[PDB]
Ligand binder design. Sequence first.
Ligand code: QHK
Length: 288
Amino acid sequence: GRLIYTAGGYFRQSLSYLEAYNPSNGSWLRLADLQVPRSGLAGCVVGGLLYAVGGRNNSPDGNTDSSALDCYNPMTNQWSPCASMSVPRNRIGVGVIDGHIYAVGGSHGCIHHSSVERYEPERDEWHLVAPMLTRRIGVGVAVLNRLLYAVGGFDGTNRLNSAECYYPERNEWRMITPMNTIRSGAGVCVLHNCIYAAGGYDGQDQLNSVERYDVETETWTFVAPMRHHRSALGITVHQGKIYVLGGYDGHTFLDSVECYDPDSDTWSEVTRMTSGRSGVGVAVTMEP
Ligand SMILES: O=C(O)CN(c1cccc(-n2ncc(C(=O)O)c2C2CC2)c1)S(=O)(=O)c1ccccc1
């Protein structure tokens, strides 16, 4: 569609913001708040509807991991609850295949999930599928050619450079080539025939480097780095360019939004969020 939606996130506490950015004119709209604050969620779109999945509500009076699935309709500017997942999943990743939402990994307290489940909007039902070979929280998830990829994360002991791919007709996960960088809390997306991994935390520093996996060659190659180091960033694709939103650079919760042009291999700053934040969910759909 036409707008980049950012939902939730964190600054001092988990946030309820829903704000939509219009690349064609630089404007930001503040829309209906989430019913429950959440950071560490993921966003996706199915059938023009925006979905917010998992996360946690970190507040002064609690830390509650979320199993929730909530649906925002831009025509109504209203959120509606959907069926909840089998388990809470903070620091989640999600991907959409053939109209179904895959929820991957994430945490529930000290439980680091390898489990994966699939939502069918037409039935308002979740079902578990085969689990990953690795437990992954802060996991980047992307879909390319109707295969599901889980990239990096944290397994409960180590941050990971490993990645793996889910083959739905076989209900099976297989490792792919590992990245050249350990990345947890990175932004992962697909552009053309490559899976991009931008930023994240490597155990020592937040990262500005960006690398992409070419599914034809099975190799990871670095591209131009972002202007800002960032972990727990939001990421999406809009008209053939990658947009990264917010995150944490080790000093500040960023309001910076950067845009990658793959033809020129350059990043530029395109706008600022209305306030700095990390751990947002991001997706693109029609204006409301
Ligand atoms: O949930 C939480 O603990 C916090 N948030 C969050 C959200 C998504 C992913 C990750 N994440 N997962 C594994 C690692 C890992 O350090 O290896 C991480 C972090 C990002 C590198 C965490 S946050 O509120 O947005 C937030 C982010 C940064 C600073 C303060 C708060």
